[PDB]
Amino acid sequence: SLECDPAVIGTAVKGKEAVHSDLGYWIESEKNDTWRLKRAHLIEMKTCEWPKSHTLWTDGIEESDLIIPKSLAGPLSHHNTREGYRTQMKGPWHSEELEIRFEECPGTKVHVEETCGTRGPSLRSTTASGRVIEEWCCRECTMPPLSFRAKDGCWYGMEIRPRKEPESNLVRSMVT
Amino acid sequence: SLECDPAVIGTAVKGKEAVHSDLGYWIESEKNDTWRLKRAHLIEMKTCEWPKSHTLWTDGIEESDLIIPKSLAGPLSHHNTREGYRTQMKGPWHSEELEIRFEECPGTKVHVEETCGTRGPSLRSTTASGRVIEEWCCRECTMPPLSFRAKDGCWYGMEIRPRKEPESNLVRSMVT
């Protein structure tokens, strides 16, 4: 009864590309050389549960590995995963139009440094003053780095933290 | 590995209809209160394993309820199920062109009789002499009856057995 309406759900695979689509959700996965989330575009956030009947590869997943959270109608699929990243509970979900993609934000860099901060609330790449933050670090995530493209700028994943920058000046999402 | 080549596999859902397709397999499933196998068309039998990456609703199934056996490249899906039927291990899989459909054979009728024979190898609807066998019985399967349409005639499912036949006249598939 809490599932999204399957009347408008469209899921398809052909070869090495897959799409989990909805009215507002367009979730692309690829095989390279294992299946992973490629990019996603969400225009209307919703809180239903994506039905297993309209989902591919629903076996042996834990909700902690779902890139798009299950509570936000993220599909319970291995196609909704990426190595080195976990569920993005504290992401910039307040925005209306969201694009999830694996690319560095403009004028930014991410480094794999075990001497880096742990996962925390998602950080925007521009200060409240509006200035770019050049250097970011990661402890376990993989490259290219998970990013969020919204109206107000580029948001980085939780695993991605800034280098020698005070996380107190930055803008942080306050949703879960 | 032991999986079918995913390069040519195409699976899609839109609303109440779903297809698990490949080069030789065309498996249609439908939503009618519950997800079930609608019809299937197989032109080349295979012994690979259908990849879960290209399969819908792979969760909480037992292989005994898969209409198309896992060994015969049947998808491990709730879409590959039908109420009152179990895996058709002893089916007419020797034939080249096979169509699975839920309909009575042209000169037969099937009744739900708990006082009927048990599961056995799939039987043709025409004797070796070539005459139709009008009456068949079922104990637990549902209607319409699962049937196989091949070049040599109509084959009934394992759950569907005849009442007035001495088991010697019939044509029995001898493959598993």
Residue numbers in the entry:
A (entry chain A), B (entry chain B): 176 to 351
Paper passage:
To understand the function of ZIKV NS1, we solved the crystal structure of ZIKV NS1172–352 from ZIKV strain Suriname (KU312312). The crystal of ZIKV NS1 β-ladder domain (NS1172–352) diffracted to a 2.8 Å resolution in Fourier space. Two β-ladder protomers were found in each asymmetric unit. These two protomers form a symmetric, head-to-head dimer through an extended, 14-stranded β-sheet seen in the dimeric assembly of DENV and WNV NS1 β-ladder structures. The dimer interface buries a total surface area of 1628 Å2. In ZIKV NS1, K227 forms a salt bridge with D234, while H253 interacts with W232 through a π-π stacking interaction at physiological pH. Remarkably, T233A, one of the mutations found in the Natal_RGN strain (KU527068), which was isolated from fetal brain tissue with severe microcephaly, is located at the NS1 dimer interface. The hydroxyl group of T233 is central in organizing a hydrogen-bonding network across the dimer interface. In particular, it has been shown that T233 also plays a pivotal role in organizing a hydrogen-bonding network across the dimer interface in other solved ZIKV NS1 structures. These structural data suggests that mutation of Thr233 to Ala would disrupt this elaborated network, and could potentially impair the stability of the dimer. Over 49% of T233A mutant are in the monomeric state. This percentile is much higher than that of the parent Suriname NS1 β-ladder domain, suggesting that T233A mutation interferes the self-association of ZIKV NS1 β-ladder domain.
